[PDB]
Design a protein around this ligand. Structure first.
Ligand SMILES: *[C@@H]1O[C@H](CO)[C@@H](O)[C@H](O)[C@H]1NC(C)=O
Lengths: 49, 49
């Protein structure tokens, strides 16, 4: 019933390709929800201007 | 109820609050309080952190 989220923000010196290296992720959040999960999605900001 | 201020007890309005504690099957939730004591450094004294 806890939804844990770890995260890390590293700066690449590329724009959009997966690099190589080691970087450990530090815990961010903890939510005592109870929710069941089986699926997920993503959200994007369109092109309009 | 036509409540009037000159009503004998037992006809005057009473406000009621019913607290109902329930325990579904989650991981946890609210709970009692927990006071905090002091800290005596340097002395084999029992402790709880
Ligand atoms: C999540 O789904 C399963 C389906 O097998 C169900 O048995 C379970 O009770 C659900 N989780 C909760 C917290 O109810």
């Amino acid at each position: 019933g806890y939804f844990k989220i770890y995260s890390k923000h590293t700066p690449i010196n590329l724009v959009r390709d997966l690099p190589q290296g080691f970087s450990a992720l530090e815990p961010l959040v903890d939510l005592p929800i109870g929710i069941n999960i089986t699926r997920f999605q993503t959200l994007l900001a369109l092109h309009r201007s | 109820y036509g409540f009037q201020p000159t009503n004998g007890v037992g006809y005057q309005p009473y406000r009621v609050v019913v607290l109902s504690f329930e325990l579904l099957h989650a991981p946890a939730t609210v709970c009692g309080p927990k006071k905090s004591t002091n800290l005596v450094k340097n002395k084999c004294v029992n402790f709880n952190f």
